[PDB]
DNA sequence: CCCC
């Protein structure tokens, strides 16, 4: 009885079409799940499909009026949707997924049960997938000039291993690292290297996504981040030269939230997925237009301290405390990286690193105690707290403090403020972000004489 | 069982109809590939294919009705997607493929293999693609008379038919080129000659693409630069008189990147490669809103220095200084370009220059020091250095410079910086280039205080 | 913006013939922009409207090109009619 | 898509 409703039965059992929340639909040709939004596939599944069909129901497939029957009872029939991309343990090849958590590869049907859309855009060959070999002899030996091994740098090299290592996890990452470094470096060699060992799920951006409104209007550079896996940011224009606009804490706040607003062209949707690992590369101490509580909870830092400079300029390297080792200067290496030499050394490692760092929850923690801007904020939370429990019961001693009662509530003039505050650091060297402190959180009393309801830790502190 | 489909099989096995990563259709008829998206071809290749399948299926290809069915059927037999245009040494003909690095014309499945899916428009003629000939003594008199073949022209000239003759590679170039000069000097006449050598491969486009957004709406004057390898926008509005606006940087950064965004009406496809060597018709020294180092090495310039005018006008051209060298007007020189007379003698002028500059690769080389908005940077380039690690045991004697220590950190005050470096640059003409220059520069110790993080070359000379 | 190559694409061509009603005739005569004053005729715009002039300005047309028609032809501009062009 |  019908046929071709059997036919449509078959296929549907096969599990290679599935709808998904956007309304398409996700076709399983050539062991990869496609969609296409002005042409359907399903007819391509249907006729690629013919094969595993019993003998009788081969031949109803050679028809297109048939095959369009049989798509459109497979509409009729798919009414539940699902889910695509929602394993972060995985990595999607042009050819299947790998597994981080396990390091095996998996081709075929055993690809097929992780819908995976995304992919890195090349194949994946197990005879490059390990750790004896001259690419990965000079890849260690590259990656160790880029980092020193010594007990200085045993955080620096931790968090540098963990950041790299967290550019293969397909889900939200709480934090934005910045690669502090300088010119001749090799932050660029890492990029390269990045590049090179995820494909194309790797994307760099320019200052655009730092220091301009993100909304706006059309703006391509955020809809590009659609399940991206990292996204770079390089060449910054210095904001301690003025003339700059300075990083805007929105713009980093929204970047952390797991959903990103932000508009493609010529496209009626807003919403796309967020799995970018954010790394900004900078030569320059940054700065931020407003600092609050939320924004240094997501900041985290690296630092790199060794050079690579020709031999003419190296005094020029050598003769300051900026910057403190001094390499050689190495040509071919970035012919040997646009080659493709060291992609799949890259990639053991990186996976090394990640089976690490795979402990139960994978999270970036922040360091926000290695950035002098906010070393004037991250003190103040030593010196300035809010109202808590009871204050009441020892006004006695906050008197002679110059504090004044008003209304059940401890208050302070501006002057005895500043001169109860200027104890612990100086006035010059921190006078800036005293007196933007002080516009900053000036309560009025009224116009003319102004009050604070903040009392320090010193006079907390000391009795 | 099912004709049709084995019509269809055949017709996919003799390898005529490919799908391009873009999602267009591309066909062979006629000794090239062709594709078009409002008039789909499969039908016509069907119909001209008809005469190489058996006697038995010729017979059913008459009916349009049965070559639809036959286009369903191949439609759904192209899944994977081929690469098409990968070739950057082939100049594409209407009936064949001529390889520039040997001088040998391909034709038939010799030139199948290279998916050219752009060409000139028009046939080769190997008997006019000869060394000897009037129209080449001719010719090479009017390019003698247009670019002097003088000392003081060695190094112009050769520039003008090096980016000439990259007009025959069909892969991204790394610079922009404008034809600067005065009226009836043979940049129109230069224009159309190469138009006529190489036919569709050149294209006409509009001052948009320079000082307009790319992405914006539908922008078909971008997207009809997929794969030309020659772009011509001339007519800059000149930009001396106020109400002209300025080219944005960051359209030439983004001219050069191997693709650009644009889309034509009623489809779907944004991608479009860039093949082009772009050159800007003008008589006047363009100027971009801001100036810096990644906008330094991407400009070119050639001039024109030959006038041609009738005999009335000709002593005024003998006493000016804009011109070196004045020669009685052609009256139908432009009607005999227009005939396309010399089309075949400028291809092999082209040719023998491009394998005259056949080096294993073909780069494109800027020329900074032939524009009047660069002078200001390029010596100031040559004057300072960034604070680099060069300044800890030298702190002694720049203190002398008026330069102070801050945290090791060598800075100098604004004061001092202006007292050392007016002696290099006038106050009163360079007053706008000096003042962005001091105040995109500065750096703030304090709010009221500041200083530059700034040493000159010559106080790091200096013990 | 004037420069050479604007100097070699302009051409002018005057008008100083007036056609006017009796009434104005006087006040035409009394200027030094007209050299001729004629009478106006009513009925020339619905005539030339009935595109009954049509075949004899194209034979006018056609002869006038045949007495230019050297084997090219090319439009030579006037730059000394224009008063911004002769400084 | 133009059009705002």
């Not at 939200?172 to 910045?178: I, N, P, R, S, Y």
């Not at 194309?200 to 809809?223: M, R, S």
């Not at 690193?353 to 402990?359: A, L, M, V």
């Not at 809010?386 to 009662?405: C, Q, R």
Request: net charge positive; proline share 5%.
């Amino acid at each position: 009885g019908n046929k071709l409703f059997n036919i449509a039965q078959r296929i549907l059992d096969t599990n290679s079409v599935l709808l998904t929340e956007r309304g398409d639909h996700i076709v399983w040709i050539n062991n990869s799940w496609k969609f296409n939004s002005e042409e359907p596939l399903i007819t391509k599944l249907i006729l690629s499909i013919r094969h595993q069909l019993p003998k009788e129901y081969s031949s109803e497939l050679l028809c297109p009026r048939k095959r369009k029957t049989v798509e459109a009872n497979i509409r009729d029939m798919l009414v539940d949707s699902v889910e695509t991309d929602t394993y972060p343990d995985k990595l999607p090849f042009k050819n299947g997924v790998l597994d981080l958590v396990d390091g095996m590869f998996y081709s075929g049907d055993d690809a097929k049960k992780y819908t995976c859309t995304v992919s890195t855009g090349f194949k994946f060959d197990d005879t490059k997938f390990v750790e004896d070999s001259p690419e990965m002899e000079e890849l260690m030996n590259i990656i160790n000039d880029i980092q020193p091994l010594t007990d200085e740098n045993k955080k620096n090299r931790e968090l540098y291993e963990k950041t790299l290592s967290s550019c293969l996890c397909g889900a939200t990452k709480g934090c934005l690292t910045f690669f502090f470094g300088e010119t001749a470096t090799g932050k660029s060699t890492t990029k390269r290297l990045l590049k090179s060992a995820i494909g194309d799920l790797f994307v760099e951006t320019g200052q655009t996504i730092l220091t301009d409104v993100l909304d706006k209007g059309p703006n391509p550079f955020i809809a590009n981040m659609h399940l991206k896996r990292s996204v770079f940011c390089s060449e910054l224009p210095d904001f301690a030269c003025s003339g700059s606009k300075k990083i805007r804490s929105d713009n980093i706040k929204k970047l952390t939230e797991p959903c990103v607003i932000g508009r493609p062209c010529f496209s009626n949707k807003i919403n796309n997925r967020n799995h970018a690992t954010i790394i900004i590369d900078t030569n320059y101490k940054p700065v931020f237009d407003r600092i609050d509580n939320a924004l240094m909870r997501r900041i985290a830092v690296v630092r790199f301290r060794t050079h690579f400079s020709q031999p003419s300029g190296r005094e020029a390297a050598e003769n300051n405390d900026a910057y403190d080792k001094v390499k050689l200067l190495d040509e071919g290496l970035d012919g040997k990286i646009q080659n493709n030499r060291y992609r799949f050394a890259f990639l053991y490692l990186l996976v090394k690193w990640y089976k690490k760092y795979h402990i139960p929850i994978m999270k970036l923690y922040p360091t926000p105690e290695e950035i002098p801007d906010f070393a004037f904020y991250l003190k103040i939370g030593t010196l300035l707290v809010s109202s808590s429990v009871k204050h009441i019961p020892l006004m006695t001693d906050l008197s002679k403090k110059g504090y004044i009662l008003y209304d059940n509530v401890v208050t302070l003039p501006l002057t005895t403020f500043q001169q109860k505050i200027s104890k612990y650091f100086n006035s010059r060297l921190f006078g800036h972000d005293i007196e933007s402190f002080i516009n900053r959180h000036k309560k009025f009393a009224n116009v003319s004489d102004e009050y604070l309801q903040y009392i320090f830790i010193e006079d907390i502190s000391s009795p």
